[PDB]
Amino acid sequence: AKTMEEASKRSYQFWDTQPVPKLGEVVNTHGPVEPDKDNIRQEPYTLPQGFTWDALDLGDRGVLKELYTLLNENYVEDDDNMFRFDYSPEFLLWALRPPGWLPQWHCGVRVVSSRKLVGFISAIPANIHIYDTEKKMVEINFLCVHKKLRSKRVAPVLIREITRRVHLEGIFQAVYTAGVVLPKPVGTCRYWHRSLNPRKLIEVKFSHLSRNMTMQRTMKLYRLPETPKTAGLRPMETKDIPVVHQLLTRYLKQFHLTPVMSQEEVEHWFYPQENIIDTFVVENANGEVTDFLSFYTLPSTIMNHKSLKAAYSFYNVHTQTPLLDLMSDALVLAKMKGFDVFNALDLMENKTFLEKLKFGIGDGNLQYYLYNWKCPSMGAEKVGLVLQ
Ligand SMILES: CCCCCCCCCCCCCC(=O)SCCNC(=O)CCNC(=O)[C@H](O)C(C)(C)COP(=O)(O)OP(=O)(O)OC[C@H]1O[C@@H](n2cnc3c(N)ncnc32)[C@H](O)[C@@H]1OP(=O)(O)O
């Protein structure tokens, strides 16, 4: 299902057995769908014959490359099946080894006879704020089955097995996103795209000519200053970690689904690493950081035939610089860094700048979910959580 009426007509054999609300039910309650089980299965779940569990050591360069290759060739595509994500090995270490990562949560599936990696799912620890509750959860990401093993019910085994391994660590709630509709979305978001290199975006058919426009007029439409306007703007440095933590923590209080990051987590997620994560702060006249913007790097391979370099807005905190100016500088910085497109969701306060800043709304939805938690749904503007 891609919309909820698609999901209105479908049977959920696996998800009906899971502690998540039914799609049809209207939810007002707050808390777990079920009580925690205090004795947990020690044995890993049975895979189909010919397949075996292997926890992937991503500190081993060969195993990280095995994982990269699986995701490069089998992970999320667009709705039109024209572009596939091209996660780099250094991005995967960033996304998969934040503070608190556990090796048993890098859960791969291999072919027994050849040891070929054919499946994967991951959990990372995350302190999550949902409405008035702050709880330790896991973020689930990179669920992936090889194309040659699709529609053999392997995905429910991966979900059950990462659940069991998370339960063993005493965690009973999880958060995750998906482009398909399942029981049951807590929030719904849409991707918006801001062209920065419109010629390239049209040759690879990511974008197309508006009616009677011309490349020369479209390039004119999306032109940017190429030197940012805000004074005091500069890359984040080690000395900025405490204030960036401070700024983010207070900014996120206005949203209903937010992460709660320690100072070490703020360092991991925001300290710049070239081709992975970019963060820029705005220092004022008296030397105090008052704003910062962030976006991460995720290229997309062109499926028909190298890649489209895409920036994704991460967390943007404004206390003195107007958010529109802050995001305008982010577009400039992305274009100086060679990015062809700048993506962002309609969550947090992004709606206040998306149209003004020439973003075009894209196709497909991004659903947010909680596992084993009852809460009312919320609008995109209330979601304050971005996952990689
Ligand atoms: C306490 C801690 C709990 C931890 C667990 C929290 C929950 C974590 C939940 C997972 C968070 C993922 C977060 C991300 O990473 S979202 C990204 C998902 N990845 C991709 O789209 C990559 C490309 N696709 C694939 O590799 C496969 O098609 C996948 C693996 C997606 C499905 O494999 P396959 O196509 O071969 O199907 P099947 O026959 O094996 O199995 C079909 C059953 O699986 C249900 N299904 C299909 N797609 C998804 C999906 N994307 N999330 C959850 N469930 C999904 C499906 O409705 C059906 O259930 P039901 O209709 O029978 O009920």
Which atom of ligand 1 approaches the CA of 14 most closely? 63
Q: Is the CB of 126 under 6 A from ligand 1?
A: no
14 is known to lie in a ligand binding site: yes
Nearest-CA residue for atom 61 of ligand 1: 12
Q: What resolution in angstrom units was achieved for this structure?
A: 2.4
CA–centroid distance, 52 to ligand 1, in Å, is: 19
**Number of neighbours of residue 196 by Cβ within 10 angstroms:** 25
CA–centroid distance, 142 to ligand 1, in Å, is: 10
Q: How many whole angstroms separate alpha carbon 126 and alpha carbon 106?
A: 15
375 is known to lie in a ligand binding site: no
153 is known to lie in a ligand binding site: yes
CA–centroid distance, 113 to ligand 1, in Å, is: 25
155 is known to lie in a ligand binding site: yes
Question: Per residue in 97-123, is it b (16+ CB within 10 Å) or e — as a string?
Answer: bbebbbeebbbbbbeeeeeebbbbbbb
Question: Per residue in 49-71, is it b (16+ CB within 10 Å) or e — as a string?
Answer: eebebbebebeeeebbebbbebb
151 is known to lie in a ligand binding site: yes
Partners of 296 in the β-ladder: 277, 312
Which atom of ligand 1 approaches the CA of 121 most closely? 15
Closest-CA residue to 304 (of 82, 77, 147): 82
Angle, vertex CA 116, rays to CA 113 and CA 118, nearest 5: 120
Closest-CA residue to 96 (of 76, 72, 122, 62): 122
State the residue for tokens 């006249």: 285
335, 336, 339, 342: CA torsion to nearest 10: -40
Which atom of ligand 1 approaches the CA of 179 most closely? 16
Q: Is the CB of 153 under 6 A from ligand 1?
A: yes
For the chain, domain boundaries? 1-388
CA–centroid distance, 153 to ligand 1, in Å, is: 9
Closest-CA residue to 142 (of 109, 185, 182, 188): 109
CA–centroid distance, 156 to ligand 1, in Å, is: 7
Nearest-CA residue for atom 18 of ligand 1: 143
Which approach determined this entry? X-ray
Best mutation site among 15, 20, 140, 143 for ligand 1, i.e. most ligand atoms within 8 A of its Cβ? 143
Which DSSP symbol is given to 378? B
Residues 6+ apart with CB under 8 A from 106: 55, 56, 57, 58, 96, 120, 122
Q: How many whole angstroms separate alpha carbon 206 and alpha carbon 83?
A: 9
Q: How many whole angstroms separate alpha carbon 286 and alpha carbon 360?
A: 38
